[PDB]
Design a protein around this ligand. Structure first.
Ligand SMILES: Nc1ncnc2c1ncn2[C@@H]1O[C@H](COP(=O)(O)OP(=O)(O)OP(=O)(O)O)[C@@H](O)[C@H]1O
Ligand SMILES: Nc1ncnc2c1ncn2[C@@H]1O[C@H](COP(=O)(O)OP(=O)(O)OP(=O)(O)O)[C@@H](O)[C@H]1O
Ligand SMILES: Cc1cn([C@H]2C[C@H](O)[C@@H](COP(=O)(O)OP(=O)(O)OP(=O)(O)O)O2)c(=O)[nH]c1=O
Ligand SMILES: Cc1cn([C@H]2C[C@H](O)[C@@H](COP(=O)(O)OP(=O)(O)OP(=O)(O)O)O2)c(=O)[nH]c1=O
Ligand SMILES: Nc1nc2c(ncn2[C@@H]2O[C@H](COP(=O)(O)OP(=O)(O)O)[C@@H](O)[C@H]2O)c(=O)[nH]1
Ligand SMILES: Nc1nc2c(ncn2[C@@H]2O[C@H](COP(=O)(O)OP(=O)(O)O)[C@@H](O)[C@H]2O)c(=O)[nH]1
Ligand SMILES: [Mg+2]
Ligand SMILES: [Mg+2]
Lengths: 683, 12, 683, 12
C-alpha cells in the first residue's frame, strides 16, 4: 500500500479511545511529497507552461488572449500567494484524480489547484485583471466553488459544456420526440445531465391521426431516451445520465413508475433514465380526502381545450376534466398511488417528487410559464415553453429549455471571511459569464432560453459542516435560524447583483416585466418580515456583516423596480457531490450521511472524516440517517423560502422505517413548502 | 414495511 | 367451424387416394356467399358509394375529382365486366382480410376486389378514363399486381405511403445518427420498411474529436435503430421491421453479426433489426486463398483518404489500406468469417448476403454511386449518396436515399394473355405515377432521390407456378431458358417504356448522361447475344408474341441514346409474400416452399394448395427444399442478368446439410453472378 | 452442423 493511503488508514486505528484525526494531515503531506510533487510537470516559468498548454490543445487561446502575460502571471502569483494546503487527503485525491489537468497519456499532472483556480478565474474575468484576482481570492479562499463542469472545463480545449443541466420540453409529436432524442444525445455528449418533461406526450392507447389505441405511451419514449443516453455515455468515463419527469395526473403515471420496479421485465424496464413525478396540490388534496382520483389522457384534453394538460392549473381544471365526457380518464386511488410512490422510493430511491403548487406558489416567472418539471438533480425549477419541432424544410416553433449555470458557496468559508455579499456578487458575475459564453448550436430551445432568461444557479454547501464546527446541531432551531439569515442574505445580494447587472448592461431577462420582481410581489415577505437572527448565538455568527433589514429590502425592491433584474433565476442548491471533497465541505445543505466515509479506491480502503470532525464536535456531526426527517424538512423549508429555484433534498431513511413513514415525510415536506424531493436513501 | 396511509398522516 | 373453412379443410381429406382440390372452389364459393356478400355494405348506386366513402374520410377527394362521374362509373363497369372469380379460398380470404376496405369498426366490407382495382386504376391514370380502363383490365386480368402499400393505400385517406421500402445512408456523426433515427421512425410511421447503411459509421473503440476509444461502434446505432423501429411499429398492426447493412470489411462485422446470436446478451442483441452483410469480391478472394484478412476502422480511412471506406473500391484499396500504418485494422480469418456467416444463416436466417462486386459489375449508375447496401428484402440495389446532416440552423448537405416503388408481374397471367409488352409498359407507367405522387417531407434525401432518380421496381411472380402449370421443372434447363427469354422481353419493354416516358416528358433521371444507358454499355450484351428460346417447347410459349431480337435491341439502344431514360432503375423482384395469395401466384421467382401450405388463422387451419396444383402437375410443383440449390442459383442468375436491381433470393436448405453446404451455395451464387441472398430457410 | 471450408469449394 502507498504511504499516504497507509497513513489515511490510521484514522480508524483508535488510540486512547479517540480517532487519529491528525493522521489525515500527515496523509496529505505524504500524498503530495511522494506522488504529486513527483508527477506534476514543472516548467522553467509560467510562460513556458502556458505555451505548452495552449500549443498542445490543452487550453483555449481565446480566453488567455484577453490578458497580457503580466496580468496572467500576477493572477497566478495571487493564487499561489495564499499557499493553499489541502486539509484532508481525500480533497487532494479528488482534485488530482478528477479535476486536475493531466497529460494526454495520463501519466503526469499538468495542473495544480492554484493553476486550475487561476485558469477558471481568468476565464471568468474576461480580460479584467482585477476581476481575475478577485475570482482567484474567492476560489483559493474556497468561498465559492464553480460547478464540476465549469470548474473542470473552464479554459480547456478538450472539454464539454460548462452547463450542468438540460431541461427539455417534449411536445406530443413524433417529430418533437425525435428532436428530443437528438437534443438529449447532443447535450449528453457535452457532459451535462438532461431532464425531459414527458407530461405532454399522450398516454398509451391514444390515437395517432384518428386511429384509436395506437400510441404505446410515454414508456416507449422513455425507452428511446434511455438508449439515447446509454449511447451518449461520454466514453463510458461517466455514464450518460438522464431524467424523465411526468405529471402524476398523466394517465401513464402507473406505467411511468412501473419501469423502476425491480420485478419489472426487461421489456418495460429503463436503466439509465432517472424518473421524477410532478405532484400538483390537487393530487395531495384527493389523497387527503380518500376520494377516487382520475388520471387523464393528455391528448383528449389537448383536443378538447386546445392546451396541454400540464399548461393548465389542475387545482382549477381537474373538475372540468372529470365532468367532461370528451376527456378520457380512468379512476385511480390517490392514496394507493402515494403508497406506490413511497415503496418505489424505498426500493430504488425513485421517483423524484416535485410538488408543482409548492414550486409555483412562489415562482416569480409564472407569466412566462409554470414550472412543470425539474432537472436530473431535482433542484432546478424554472419556467419552460415547449418547442413545436415541425417537419423538415418547415420552420420550427422554438420554445424555452432550462440549463444549469451552477455554482456553490462554501458556507463555512463564506462566513469565516464575513463576505456573504462579496462572495454572492462575485459568484453571480461568474455564473452570468458562464451563461453568456454558453452557445449550444444543436439545442435551439436551450440556446434561446439561455440567451433570453439568463438564468443561473447559485447554491450553497457545507451547511452541516459549518453548523457542527460552530457547535450547532443540524436539527436545532438555532441552525434553522442561521440558515434563514444566511440564505436571506444570499438572496438579497443575488437580487442586488442581478439588478446591478441589469443596470450596467441596460437589459433585463426576457419577459421580466411580468415577473413578480417587477410587480414587487416577490419582495412582500422581505419587506414585511425581518429575517435577522432570533438567537444571540446565531447573531454573533453574523457579527461584522451588515444583515439586510426590512428597510434594506425596501430599497432593494425599489432598485429592482427602477433598474430591473438580469437573471430570471439565481439560486438553486445542487447536491454538490465529488467537488465537495475538493472544497473540504459537506455535500450541499444536506446532513452528513456518515461521520467517516469508507471509500474503496483500487485495492485500497480510504477513509474520509467530514471536515472539522473531532472529539469536541463528534455529536454535532450527527449522521443524516439518525436525524429526524421532519426537522430536516424544517431546515430545508427554512432555506427553501430564500431560494427562488428548488433544493436537491435527499431523504435519509432507516431500514426500520416503513412506507407510511416515507409518505409522512413527503406530505410534511409538501405541507412545509418543500418544492422538490430528490432521493430516498435507505440505510 | 408497506404500511398504508391513514387519514391522520395528511394533517400536521 | 365456418362452412368455407370446413370445405377448405376437405382438400387433404383424400378420396380414392387423390386430393380433393375441387373443394377449394367450393370453399371460396361458400366463403363469398356466407360471409362476404352478407358482410358487404351495398349502395343503391355508385354515386352513393363514392359520396359515402369520400365524406367518411375513406377516399381522397382529390384523385376522384379529375374524372367526371360517368367516367368513374364506366371504369367500375369495365372492372365488373370481367366478372372476376377468385380461384382459391385463400385468395379471397387474404384480400378481404388484409386489403379490402372495411368500416371504422372493421365490421362490414366497403370494397370488393373490383372496387379496390377500380380505385387503384383511377389513382394511377390521374384524369385519363381510357388509361384508367387499361389499368382496370391489367389488374382484373391479374397480369400486374401493385405492391401491397400501393394496392392497399391508393386513393385512400387513412393511408401511409405507397412506397414499400426505404434505404437510408447513415453518415459518421451524432447529428447524422440522430437524423437517421428520426427518419427511420418517420418512414416506419408511413408503413414502409427501412434499411440503413452502417458501413460509414466508425468502428468501436475509435476516436471522437481527439477522445480515443470512445465510440460504441455500429452496434450502439443498431440498438438505437432497433428501439426506434419497436417504438414506430405501426401501433401494432405489423411490427416495425428495419434493416441494417454493414460491409464485411468493417471492423464491427463480428459485433454486427453477434447481434443475431441466440447466446448474445440483451445488451448487444437486437430483435427488430434485420442484418445484412455486404461482401466485396476481395473478401471472397481472400477466403479462397486462405490468406489472413483485415477488417478496417472506417474513421482512420476517412482521415487518411478523405472518403468513407464503403465509398472506395475494396478490390483496389485493400492492399493500400493494409500497407497504410495510419489505417487502423484488426486481423480476421475470412474463411472463419464465412463459416460464421453460414452458421448464422443456418441458425437464424441472417445476415442478408450482398455481393457488392456482383452488383456493381453490371450496375448502370456507378457514376452516381456504387450500390453499397440493399433493402430490407435484399432486392433494391440502387446508387445512393450519404446526407451530411449538420447542426441546427446550419444547412444540411442532402444526398440521395433510395425509395423503391414496387410492382409485380404475374408471369402466368402475363404469358397466358400474350401481353408482355402492354403489361410491362402499363406497370412502368403506374410505378412512375406512384413515384411522382409520393412526397416525403420528413426525409429530405428520400424525397430528393425520388424526385431525381425516379427509380421504380417492376418485379415478377408466379414463375414456378407458370412453369409447373406448363409441365416445366423449375430446375430444368427449359425453365432457365424461359426465364431468360421472358425477363429479356420484360427488360426490353421496361427500357422502351422508360425511354418513351423520357421522350414524352422531355426529362431523364438525374445524372443519366453518365450511366451505361447513355453510353450504350448496358445494351452491349443485348446487341451481341440473342436471348430467344433455345428449346422448341419454350419458344412455343412465346407464340403470338414478338420476342425482341438483336436488331430490336439495337433500335432500342439507339432510341435510348436519342431520348434518354426516365427511370434510373426499373426492375427489382420483391418476395411479394402477401399479395401472392390474392393473385393466386407463387411468391416471387422463388420455387414453392410447400405444395399445400398449412396456415392457422384463429382456431381453424386453412390449407392453401399451390396455384394450379393438381394430380398431373404434382411433381412439377417440386418443393424448394427438395430442389438442388445450385439449380435455383442458376435460375436466379439467369433471371438476374435481365434485372438491373436485385432479386430476393431465399435459400431453402435441409437440416441434413451443414454450414459447408451453405457456404458452397453462397460461393456458387457469388460465382454465378447472384447479387443478393435474402434468407436461409431450414426445413 | 459446422463443417469447415476445405477449399475446392471456391471452385466449381
Ligand atoms: N498538506 C498539504 N496540502 C497541500 N499541498 C501540500 C501539502 N503538503 C505539501 N504540499 C505541497 O508540496 C510542496 C512541498 O511540501 P512541503 O510541505 O515540504 O513544503 P514547504 O516548502 O516546506 O512549504 P512552504 O512553501 O509553505 O514553506 C508544497 O509547496 C505544496 O505545493
Ligand atoms: N368464386 C367466386 N369468386 C368471386 N366472387 C364470387 C365467387 N363465388 C361467388 N362470388 C360472389 O358471390 C356472388 C354470387 O355468386 P354466384 O356465382 O351465384 O353469382 P352470379 O352473378 O349469379 O354468377 P354467374 O357468374 O354464374 O352469373 C357473385 O356475384 C360474386 O359477387
Ligand atoms: C457522441 C458520440 C459519438 N459516437 C460516435 C458515433 C459517430 O459515428 C461518431 C461521430 O461523432 P461526431 O458527432 O461526428 O463527433 P464530432 O463531430 O464532435 O468529432 P469528430 O468529427 O472528430 O469525430 O462518433 C458514439 O459512438 N457515441 C457517442 O456518444
Ligand atoms: C408515429 C408514432 C406516434 N406515436 C405517438 C407519440 C406522439 O406523442 C404522438 C403524436 O404523433 P404525431 O407525430 O403528432 O402523429 P400525427 O401528427 O400524425 O398524429 P395527430 O395528427 O393525431 O396528432 O403519437 C407513437 O406512440 N408511436 C408512433 O409510432
Ligand atoms: N515556474 C513555474 N511556475 C508556475 C508553474 N505553474 C504555475 N506556476 C505559478 O505561476 C507563477 C509564475 O511563476 P514564474 O513564471 O516562475 O515567476 P518568476 O519566479 O518571476 O520566474 C508562480 O507564482 C507559480 O507559482 C510552472 O509549471 N512553473
Ligand atoms: N349499385 C352499386 N354499384 C356498385 C357499388 N360498388 C361498386 N359498384 C359497381 O359500380 C358500377 C355502377 O353501376 P350502376 O350505378 O349500378 O349502373 P346501373 O346498373 O345502370 O344502375 C356497377 O357496375 C357496380 O358493379 C355499390 O355499392 N352499389
Ligand atoms: Mg402532431
Ligand atoms: Mg463528425
Amino acid at each position: 500500500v502507498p504511504k499516504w493511503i497507509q497513513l489515511n488508514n490510521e484514522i480508524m486505528i483508535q488510540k486512547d479511545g479517540k480517532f487519529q484525526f491528525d493522521k489525515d494531515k500527515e496523509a496529505v503531506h505524504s500524498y503530495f511529497v511522494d506522488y504529486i510533487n513527483q508527477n506534476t510537470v514543472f516548467f522553467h516559468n509560467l510562460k513556458e507552461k502556458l505555451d505548452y498548454l495552449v500549443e498542445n490543445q490543452y487550453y483555449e487561446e481565446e480566453f488567455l488572449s484577453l490578458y497580457s502575460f503580466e496580468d496572467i502571471k500576477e493572477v497566478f502569483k495571487t493564487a499561489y500567494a495564499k499557499k493553499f494546503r489541502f486539509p484532508s487527503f481525500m480533497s487532494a485525491f479528488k482534485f488530482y484524480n478528477d479535476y486536475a489537468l493531466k497529460t494526454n497519456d495520463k501519466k503526469k499532472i499538468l495542473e495544480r489547484y492554484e493553476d486550475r483556480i487561476s485558469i477558471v478565474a481568468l476565464f471568468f474575468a474576461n480580460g479584467d485583471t482585477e476581476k481575475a484576482k478577485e475570482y482567484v481570492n474567492l476560489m483559493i479562499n474556497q468561498e465559492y466553488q464553480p460547478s464540476t463542469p465549469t470548474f473542470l472545463n473552464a479554459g480547456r480545449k478538450r472539454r464539454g459544456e460548462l452547463v450542468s443541466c438540460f431541461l427539455l420540453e417534449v411536445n406530443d409529436s413524433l417529430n418533437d420526440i425525435s428532436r428530443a432524442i437528438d437534443i438529449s444525445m447532443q447535450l449528453s455528449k457535452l457532459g451535462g445531465g438532461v431532464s425531459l418533461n414527458l407530461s405532454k406526450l399522450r398516454a398509451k392507447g391514444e390515437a395517432i391521426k384518428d386511429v384509436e389505441n395506437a400510441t404505446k405511451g410515454v414508456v416507449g419514449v422513455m425507452k428511446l431516451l434511455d438508449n439515447a443516453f446509454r449511447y451518449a455515455d461520454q466514453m463510458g468515463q461517466r455514464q450518460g445520465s438522464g431524467a424523465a419527469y411526468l405529471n402524476i395526473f398523466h394517465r401513464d403515471i402507473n406505467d411511468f413508475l412501473d419501469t423502476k420496479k425491480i420485478s419489472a421485465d426487461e421489456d418495460v424496464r429503463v436503466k439509465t433514465l432517472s424518473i421524477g413525478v410532478v405532484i400538483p396540490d390537487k393530487f395531495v388534496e384527493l389523497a387527503r380526502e380518500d376520494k377516487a382520483a382520475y388520471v387523464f389522457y393528455p391528448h383528449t384534453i389537448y383536443k378538447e381545450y386546445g392546451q396541454h394538460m400540464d399548461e393548465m392549473d389542475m387545482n382549477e381544471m381537474y373538475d372540468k376534466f372529470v365532468d367532461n365526457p370528451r376527456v378520457k380518464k380512468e379512476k385511480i386511488n390517490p392514496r394507493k398511488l402515494l403508497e406506490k410512490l413511497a415503496m418505489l422510493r424505498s426500493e430504488s430511491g425513485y421517483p423524484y417528487i416535485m410538488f408543482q403548487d409548492n414550486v409555483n406558489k412562489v415562482h416569480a416567472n409564472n407569466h412566462i410559464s409554470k414550472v412543470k418539471f425539474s432537472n436530473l438533480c431535482s433542484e432546478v425549477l424554472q419556467a419552460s415553453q415547449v418547442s413545436s419541432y415541425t417537419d423538415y424544410d418547415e420552420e420550427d416553433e422554438i420554445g424555452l429549455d432550462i440549463s444549469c449555470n451552477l455554482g456553490s458557496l462554501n458556507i463555512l468559508n463564506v462566513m469565516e471571511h464575513k463576505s456573504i455579499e462579496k462572495t454572492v456578487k462575485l459568484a453571480t458575475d461568474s455564473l452570468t459569464h458562464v451563461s453568456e459564453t454558453t452557445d449550444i448550436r444543436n439545442a435551439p430551445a436551450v440556446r434561446r432560453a439561455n440567451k433570453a432568461m439568463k438564468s443561473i444557479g447559485l447554491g450553497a454547501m457545507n451547511l452541516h459542516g459549518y453548523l457542527a464546527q460552530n457547535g450547532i446541531a443540524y436539527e436545532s432551531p438555532e441552525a434553522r435560524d442561521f440558515a434563514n439569515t444566511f440564505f436571506m442574505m444570499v438572496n438579497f445580494y443575488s437580487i442586488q447583483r442581478s439588478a446591478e447587472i441589469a443596470k450596467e448592461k441596460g437589459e433585463t431577462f426576457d419577459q421580466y416585466e411580468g415577473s413578480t420582481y417587477a410587480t414587487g410581489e416577490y419582495f412582500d415577505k422581505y419587506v414585511s418580515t425581518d429575517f435577522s437572527p432570533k438567537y444571540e448565538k446565531i447573531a454573533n455568527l453574523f457579527e461584522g456583516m451588515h444583515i439586510p433589514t426590512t428597510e434594506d429590502w425596501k430599497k432593494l425592491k425599489a432598485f429592482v423596480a427602477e433598474h430591473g433584474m438580469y437573471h430570471s433565476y439565481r439560486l438553486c442548491i445542487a447536491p454538490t457531490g465529488s467537488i465537495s471533497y475538493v472544497q473540504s465541505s459537506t455535500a450541499s445543505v444536506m446532513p452528513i450521511m456518515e461521520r467517516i466515509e469508507e471509500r474503496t479506491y483500487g485495492n485500497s480502503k480510504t477513509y474520509y472524516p467530514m471536515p472539522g470532525l473531532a472529539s469536541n464536535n463528534w455529536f454535532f456531526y450527527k449522521e443524516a440517517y439518525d436525524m429526524d426527517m421532519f426537522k430536516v424538512v424544517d431546515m430545508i423549508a427554512t432555506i427553501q423560502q430564500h431560494i427562488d429555484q428548488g433544493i436537491s433534498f435527499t431523504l435519509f431513511l432507516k431500514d426500520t422505517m416503513t412506507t407510511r413513514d416515507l409518505n409522512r415525510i413527503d406530505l410534511y415536506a409538501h405541507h412545509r413548502g418543500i418544492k422538490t424531493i430528490y432521493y430516498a436513501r435507505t440505510k | 414495511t408497506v404500511e398504508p396511509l391513514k387519514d391522520d398522516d395528511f394533517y400536521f
